[PDB]
Amino acid sequence: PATRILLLVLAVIIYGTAGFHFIEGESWTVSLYWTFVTIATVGYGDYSPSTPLGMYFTVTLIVLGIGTFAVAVERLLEFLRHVVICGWSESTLECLRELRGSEVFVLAEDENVRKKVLRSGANFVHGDPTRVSDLEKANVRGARAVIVDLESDSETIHCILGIRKIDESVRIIAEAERYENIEQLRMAGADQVISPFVISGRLMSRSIDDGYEAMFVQDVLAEESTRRMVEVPIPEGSKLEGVSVLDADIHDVTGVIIIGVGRGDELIIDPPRDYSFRAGDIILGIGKPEEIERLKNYISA
Amino acid sequence: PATRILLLVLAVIIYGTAGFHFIEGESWTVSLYWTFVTIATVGYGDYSPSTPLGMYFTVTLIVLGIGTFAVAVERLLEFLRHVVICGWSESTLECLRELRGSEVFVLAEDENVRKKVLRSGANFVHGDPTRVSDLEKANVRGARAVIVDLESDSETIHCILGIRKIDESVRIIAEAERYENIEQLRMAGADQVISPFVISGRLMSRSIDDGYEAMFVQDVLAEESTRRMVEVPIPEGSKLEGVSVLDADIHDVTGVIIIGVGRGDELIIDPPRDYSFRAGDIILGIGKPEEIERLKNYISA
Amino acid sequence: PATRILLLVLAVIIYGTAGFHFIEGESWTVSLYWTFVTIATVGYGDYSPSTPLGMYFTVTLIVLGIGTFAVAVERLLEFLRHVVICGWSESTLECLRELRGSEVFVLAEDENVRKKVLRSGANFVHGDPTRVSDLEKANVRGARAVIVDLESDSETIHCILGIRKIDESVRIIAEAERYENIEQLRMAGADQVISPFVISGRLMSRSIDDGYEAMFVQDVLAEESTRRMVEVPIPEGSKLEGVSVLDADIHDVTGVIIIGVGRGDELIIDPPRDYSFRAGDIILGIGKPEEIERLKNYISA
Amino acid sequence: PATRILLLVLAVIIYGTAGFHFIEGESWTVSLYWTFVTIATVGYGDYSPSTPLGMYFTVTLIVLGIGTFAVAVERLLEFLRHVVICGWSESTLECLRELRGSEVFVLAEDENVRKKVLRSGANFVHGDPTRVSDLEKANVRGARAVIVDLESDSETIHCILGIRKIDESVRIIAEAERYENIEQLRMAGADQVISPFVISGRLMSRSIDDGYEAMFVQDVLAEESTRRMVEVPIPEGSKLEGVSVLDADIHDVTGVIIIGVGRGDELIIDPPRDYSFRAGDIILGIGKPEEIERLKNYISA
Amino acid sequence: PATRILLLVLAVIIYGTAGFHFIEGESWTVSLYWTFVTIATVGYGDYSPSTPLGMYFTVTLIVLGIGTFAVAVERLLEFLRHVVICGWSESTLECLRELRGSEVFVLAEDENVRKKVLRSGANFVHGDPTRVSDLEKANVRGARAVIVDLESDSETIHCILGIRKIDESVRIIAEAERYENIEQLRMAGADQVISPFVISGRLMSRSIDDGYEAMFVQDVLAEESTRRMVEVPIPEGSKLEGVSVLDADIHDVTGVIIIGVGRGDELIIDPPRDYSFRAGDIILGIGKPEEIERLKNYISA
Amino acid sequence: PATRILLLVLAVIIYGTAGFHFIEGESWTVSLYWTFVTIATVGYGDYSPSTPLGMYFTVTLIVLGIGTFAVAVERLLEFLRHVVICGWSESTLECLRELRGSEVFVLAEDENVRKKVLRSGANFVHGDPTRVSDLEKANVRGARAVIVDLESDSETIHCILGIRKIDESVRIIAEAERYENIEQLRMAGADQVISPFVISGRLMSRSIDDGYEAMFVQDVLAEESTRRMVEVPIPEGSKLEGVSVLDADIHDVTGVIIIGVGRGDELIIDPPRDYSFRAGDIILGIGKPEEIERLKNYISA
């Protein structure tokens, strides 16, 4: 019915522009040109509608002059490597703050959010991350990875399954509100789970004494003090491949502290001395950018 | 007034047991013995109250027999280095899970909580952590340290000031729900602030790539894989005091990775080579317990 | 993306005005002049777009005529000694009623308020007085003084710290909803605290007898009865400095009852006879304006 | 019906104790003595109810043994110049804090209140102060005066009319939540009206400058600093009656500042010099208790 | 299951009293007499349970001494021409106020009601008048008539159908909350419908002028001024049957104003002069009781 | 600030029309005529703005062409014997249905109402009938009479006092939601009180038997059956004044049943025979319009 009114304002043009070539200077060709020109509150002057009786029909083009302008308006506006964030929460916000330098889409239920999700360098997709149809509104298929944090682990567990139901291989990262659901959250298909509260809690209990243990975690993740925790990959042909951690003395050599090495989906912290670097191996280390750069070279080719 | 009714039920014993040695076999000594015995619906038989007239006074001991039984009941049940946790939240819960091996008191508004705060090795103090009077119900004065996490940073900021208002030196550790209040949370007097959401968010944005950076934080704080992040202090007389990090090769020597050194209230991550250990200095390092033990000795005296 | 649509409505002018100098009287200079003139539903007549084929391109300028007018509208509006009142409550309202003769800004969360905060001689700044960013929207830095009354002492305590966090010297005046928080309210940084309820309550208990005690407080603060409570300062060179209250007989002399003298941040009520006026001293007294004027002179130079 | 069940448990004693002198050793006198003794789970032993057939009737005394014990219990506890406070609010609370040394009854809708209204030296009457029937539950008729503060001026206006509807002369004191209703609050019958917010507001606006004006009001009503605002009456035969305020130099003489004199229902603040004290006159003055005592004597007889 | 536990506490008496005639002085007759006497915390002394081994079985009678006392308690209190009112509202209340002199049952959802429905001379049946099962709890089948007023016409319409579903002939009287449902309320089966609001409204509009029209309705229905609106039936053999209203001059004769005559389910107001009384006819008239009595006789036989 | 933007759109006319007499054909008189003509998307053609450089300033009149049209719009619409109904309820609605043939104003809090209060022949005044300022928005002063029905008797009691506070003589008609407040409702100043529920209730209890008594009230107030309840006044010079009800036989004479006579503010139902009509007396009677007309004449002069 909304597109059925654009037929009445289209008929007024064949009824309003019709009396132009009939009640004035004949021109069945430039008849609509008079109507559109007149209705568009233009009034250039290609026909002042002089006829008196044609002034009565010219008055009709004034009445139905808004029944096509205020009409074709809502009808003209009723046609014409990215990351998706399901759910909009502080976690999400703080996250969107880092991903600022890239294409991010926040899919959320509450519209009121929009305005702010925009104040932060992200695009807003109004929908419910639980409905696959809306997940698609954010194009999860092509999402480099999806971050999920809804109000209740239940809704999150849902959203995940939904995502799976589309691209069953996108990297999904979810926040767990309660420790007791971390596993279900994985079963559902989350690849990585983060439990802000378990971290927070432990850090608390661990800062009753001295708060360095908690000072570490928070400071390291903050873009301050130069020192930066970085994960460096070992190229296929590495002058290390086969070498022992103990033998490479990466610290003495690079200055980059290695807090652990990773074999996709798994990571070891104080890697034992007799550890042997491989190809896909990833180095989790903290260090001055220089040190880092130096570390990359000490491995290159 | 609740303890003023225990004087009426105590006077009924001097009025009920009084007629025993007066309206029966004289015995001002074993008079109360008859009243208590009778009121206790015992009726052993040391005096069947035979007197007819004394049966009228024996009936009074039956009427006021519940005005001392149903009384001394709620009156008998109305008499017979610790950590205080203000607010009961997941963070709090997860925290109370570590502090299990010690005296912990959770002060919260909602009673329904109690039952669970008990299922977890902690004692419950029903009150509002914003009211100083209730803070005192949990004895903050003697609290080794107070952990604070209320529903809204506002209420937390409050609670803190409150605590300050009592022991202006207790170590206060608070969680911040929003990044924008971390500072006010300190001004108010929080010594240590933890923002689960800032951590969570960043870890997220940092795990779009590879999730080791986030795998580290969560795994390190979990009592698994042997490896343990520990903060070891440098005794006053240390065979290191004055020595350079570069010179002590603590890693090669101990095997304990040092992720940073701390000077009370502050911590440096990749301490520069030319750093010189001092007395109060604290070593933040991850390593096998053995390694740790070994690290402590490599410093002792 | 909201500023990326202003490039499409900017391209329609290079595509709509482009066909003007091509499908009509050549004029690559006054081509945009035809498009803008036409799109602005003006139709002066500098070119009636006569060409039939140019009438087809002239119709395109009518269709995309709103895709630049309804566009450049939200884009043109998307670029282009005062007192601040945080929180909007009856207290606040009644207060804004006195400050009518001056620059006042009310900063509040609920928009619905606006309309009324305007009916009262004040400017409205929509924001949350707890967020420093919004405090700044009201320019607390330059605020002569800030009045604070939010729904819960907690939120107030918050707001205060926030203010402190900016101009750590602005005079802050806060209302306390509960007696038990008057101190925390100060610790946080409130300079002056008013507890309407403590006043109200006491006045009540004090008016069970005769209601003069309560009739005084309310009447004195009301702009009626001539009598006015005034605080008069003692100039540096005063013919009183050093004189005893008993000796100056200010009442007999001036007629201005002195209910107390104040030494910045502190005030004494029935100042003892042997009190000696000083320089900065402030006289809190009630009296007929004349009496007052008379009091000022009895001290001048 | 609650007192009609005490006739069934009284008939069981005439039916339970009746079979004792009929189905055992005859004794229509000591028959109830066996029933009461038995029902009271006493079992002294004055009759072991040996009869086998009488053991069937002795069993009936065991069944209806609780139909008289659990009965006469709630029946024994259901029998064995004051001020009424309608509504329970901070104002009210702070007020009840002064009236501690006297008989006060708080009548309120929410039961949850009770416990606290008791922690404060007052008695609680659960009811709605708007329903006359409940007002009567608090005996307004005999109330020395009624204090009224309900959640909304409307409810208060109501409550008042209600009170009027009973003792149309009790001194009613009400708090007004909004300035715009102070008059209706009076029309309804309130004798004294207190608007905590109008006071609070004004004090605020008045403390932007220096806060003495607000320091006065709050401090004077506080039982401190010794100084106490008192209203002293002029006895019938006074060595002042007829004397001029100017002539009595009460301040110089007593030390008690007189902030105003009152002629029932009315009070003048800086009484003009040519004022003449009368009989019923009341002196509103602030001063050290000694000063006060001294003031009373300077008038006695 | 609640009555299945009274079989376990009944088996403990055949198991507890069984060891009495087995582990003591033989008496299979007075065995239960020992168990009941012992379990009733009586201890008269007809058997002190002396046997040591029988003291082990006498201890079992002490353990299961509460598993029959605390049991038979809630089991002893769990056994020991009327009008039904569905829904409890002011209308209902005001109605129950008239029906005070008779058997009335109020069936309602909210339990909190009970206490009051009892303060008014009625019995309370806790249930939902929409559920037939609960309608039956109030025995509508035998209800002289059912009055229905639930919160929403919808629920009422429901309740009615429900009632119909049982006694499809009980006189149902329902209140309609909205004028627009009076008919549906009848279709559903209400026999009589009352719309307090339509009455109220009209009376209002009719009392803008003079309020007699509204003074009539309210006063007539109030048990005051002697005058009473009464409906008197015309006996089968009446000295009026066939007589004209004009001819009977009932007013002049009786003094009872006849405001209308009724033919079951219908009533005419100013019956025309030429009206002829019949048998079942009912006379709606107002008049002094005497007048009424006089009217009854002027028709008798 | 809303009227401060009309100075910027007024300055654009002195800045936009200014370049017309400077960058075109000089005419400081008809300069604003070009601006207003241009901004009004008129484009008559009195100046096509030919100048190229003036086309750059002519473009500025296109940009700021909406900053005066979309402005002066909300600024042009932001300047340019009756009955008042306080509160909008079914009662009210049903009432407004009768008063259809007259000037009625409904003053209510909820805006959503408006639309409907209009569908019914009444004018809507959005405000709170409790605030005198809004009562005045409906001009109670001149209200022929005010009808009051708010959600709670409390709010009504309020509203009344408010009304009194303005025209202390307007006829006030109020509905009482609860029987227990009918008196307070009067004390407050209601002149006439209607209790739909008391009526409804009684009618119910009275229709358990036969429902004529309730059929009467509802039918009489309904504009059906010809019969109409009317109140006819006795003119000053009446051929009845002094005559006995018994003597005037108004029924026999007129046919109009007299259900009662009224002496302002009071009404008697079956007026005793020996009653004597007076001047101001009002006759409450039901009867055919003819009968009525006939009744008026039987009294005229």
Ligand SMILES: [Ca+2]
């Ligand atoms: Ca979250």
Ligand SMILES: [Ca+2]
């Ligand atoms: Ca939390």
Ligand SMILES: [Ca+2]
């Ligand atoms: Ca407030």
Ligand SMILES: [Ca+2]
């Ligand atoms: Ca209050």
Ligand SMILES: [Ca+2]
């Ligand atoms: Ca109803």
Ligand SMILES: [Ca+2]
């Ligand atoms: Ca109503």
